[PDB]
Amino acid sequence: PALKYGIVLDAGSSHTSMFVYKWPADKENDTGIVGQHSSCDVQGGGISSYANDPSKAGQSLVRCLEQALRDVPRDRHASTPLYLGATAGMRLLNLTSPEATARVLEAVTQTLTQYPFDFRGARILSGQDEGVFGWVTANYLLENFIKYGWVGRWIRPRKGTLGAMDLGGASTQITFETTSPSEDPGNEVHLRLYGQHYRVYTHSFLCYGRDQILLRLLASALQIHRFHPCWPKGYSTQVLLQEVYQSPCTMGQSAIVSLSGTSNATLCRDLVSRLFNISSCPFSQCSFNGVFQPPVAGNFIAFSAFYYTVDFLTTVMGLPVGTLKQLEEATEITCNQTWTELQARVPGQKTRLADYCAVAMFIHQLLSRGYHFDERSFREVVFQKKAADTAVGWALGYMLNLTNLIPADLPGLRKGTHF
Ligand SMILES: Nc1ncnc2c1ncn2[C@@H]1O[C@H](COP(=O)(O)OP(=O)(O)NP(=O)(O)O)[C@@H](O)[C@H]1O
Ligand SMILES: [Ca+2]
């Protein structure tokens, strides 16, 4: 019909992606109505990777913005909002240099303002935003905010919502509806969506994204072993120590050292275990690092690097991961492969290949020791990256919020029929 459009640039730690969304101009407040029209993946690094060359951050966006001009009808350009939101790459850069951060944001802002779209700003999202908006995305797309039943016979309990686990490159988020009392205001979220209240727990672990965890494990391996037990036997590389220790995530842990793998699953497990501090909890219950967390409950979607890693274990290693024990076994087996054994499973490009043992191990420990999934609760986790032909992430939920497309109440309160 008469369609409206909106554009979000997702400026992550390791990449920028552009999403174009579209929806009917007159059904626009219905849940699940907005869908993904197109997307584009910016070549090269995330915007924070241009900390020392900020004008390039803007320029990196140009090819995808030219695509947006083709993707969105010209008569709609002027009224199509365009947002850029940045995540943990930029949060980390702000810790190093607020000035470099400001310049990168100035540069993207300058570039986006040249385009005919209604540009509504480039902002850095908080960890909370990032978590909650991915949770809104998943549940919006799946129509979990619908009030199921009919007059005089409403389903009770209300339709459950899908928890969200996001494993990015520099941070990781966990978000789910909970009935538990909140013990920490920084974790407590209250939403009013379609006349309903959702009590939500969220937390973002900075430095617990995939790329930063790989750096911490490398730093740890260099310090403890002078070999890398999580790398496969026969794999070695020259490590630039400058790069290992420049991150805020590792600076608390001979310009070049050779480092070789040893396919040692048990020492890998030991190395990964040190990532999680379970020694104190100022609350009734914690995940790890003294962070409050109520018991995990309900179904969960695990996307981003949770998905990519499970996809590798299932599709490439050909291993089942339906249970925590299976995931643990799949990890041991992956970790015990030699570099030649591993490469033979991957006829094509091998970027990331040596790191799968470490990431799978981290994921297993994060879920079981960090979040305290057990067999019963893990049965309710699904690994997917797409719902209703839309990429799952925080971008849709962010656009929904900023365009005010999710009503707090239904029109006229649906005559009070949901009271
Ligand atoms: N297609 C892929 N296959 C395997 N791994 C991938 C793929 N795409 C991205 N990754 C890796 O998975 C991790 C998470 O990717 P992504 O979710 O894009 O992070 P991000 O948004 O750049 N980081 P953050 O700012 O912390 O959310 C990164 O370490 C990527 O290198
Ligand atoms: Ca991300």
From Swiss-Prot:
Its EC number is 3.6.1.-. InterPro entries: GDA1_CD39_NTPase (IPR000407). One of its GO terms (molecular function) is ADP phosphatase activity. Its cofactor is Ca(2+); Mg(2+). It is an enzyme of class 3 (hydrolase). It holds the Pfam family GDA1_CD39. GO terms for cellular component: basement membrane; cell body; cell projection membrane; cell surface; plasma membrane. It comes from the Eukaryota. Expressed in brain, heart, vas deferens, kidney, skeletal muscle, thymus, lung and spleen. Weak expression in liver. The active site is at residue 130. Residues 1-419 are extracellular. One of its GO terms (biological process) is G protein-coupled receptor signaling pathway. Glycans are attached at residues 29, 94, 264, 277, 336, 401. Disulfide bonds join 40-64, 207-249, 230-268, 281-286, 335-357. ATP binds at residues 169-173. In the nervous system, could hydrolyze ATP and other nucleotides to regulate purinergic neurotransmission. Hydrolyzes ADP only to a marginal extent. Belongs to the GDA1/CD39 NTPase family. This is Ectonucleoside triphosphate diphosphohydrolase 2. The lineage of its organism: Eukaryota, Metazoa, Chordata, Craniata, Vertebrata.
